Design a protein around this motif. Structure first.
Motif, PDB file in Angstrom:
ATOM      1  N   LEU A   8      24.384  43.993 107.074  1.00 40.77           N
ATOM      2  CA  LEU A   8      24.826  43.359 105.858  1.00 40.77           C
ATOM      3  C   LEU A   8      25.713  42.152 106.161  1.00 40.77           C
ATOM      4  CD1 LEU A   8      25.685  45.683 102.913  1.00 40.77           C
ATOM      5  CD2 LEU A   8      25.246  43.218 102.871  1.00 40.77           C
ATOM      6  N   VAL A   9      26.759  42.375 106.953  1.00 41.51           N
ATOM      7  CA  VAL A   9      27.677  41.300 107.309  1.00 41.51           C
ATOM      8  C   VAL A   9      26.914  40.129 107.917  1.00 41.51           C
ATOM      9  CG1 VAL A   9      28.204  41.761 109.736  1.00 41.51           C
ATOM     10  CG2 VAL A   9      30.002  40.977 108.188  1.00 41.51           C
ATOM     11  N   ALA A  15      23.897  33.257 105.141  1.00 41.58           N
ATOM     12  CA  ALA A  15      23.948  32.912 103.723  1.00 41.58           C
ATOM     13  C   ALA A  15      24.841  31.699 103.491  1.00 41.58           C
ATOM     14  CB  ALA A  15      24.478  34.098 102.915  1.00 41.58           C
ATOM     15  N   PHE A  16      25.814  31.510 104.371  1.00 43.18           N
ATOM     16  CA  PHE A  16      26.729  30.385 104.254  1.00 43.18           C
ATOM     17  C   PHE A  16      25.982  29.070 104.465  1.00 43.18           C
ATOM     18  CE2 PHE A  16      29.975  32.973 103.289  1.00 43.18           C
ATOM     19  CZ  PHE A  16      31.262  32.465 103.504  1.00 43.18           C
TER      20      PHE A  16
END
Length: 17
Positions: A8-9, A15-16
């Motif tokens: 997840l992390v 995503a950034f």
């Protein structure tokens, strides 16, 4: 053993950009 939290992390990282 299996996991998911580490995945997840790692998702937010890309995503950034």
């Amino acid at each position: 053993f299996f996991s998911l939290i580490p995945k997840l992390v790692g998702g937010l990282i890309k995503a950034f950009k």
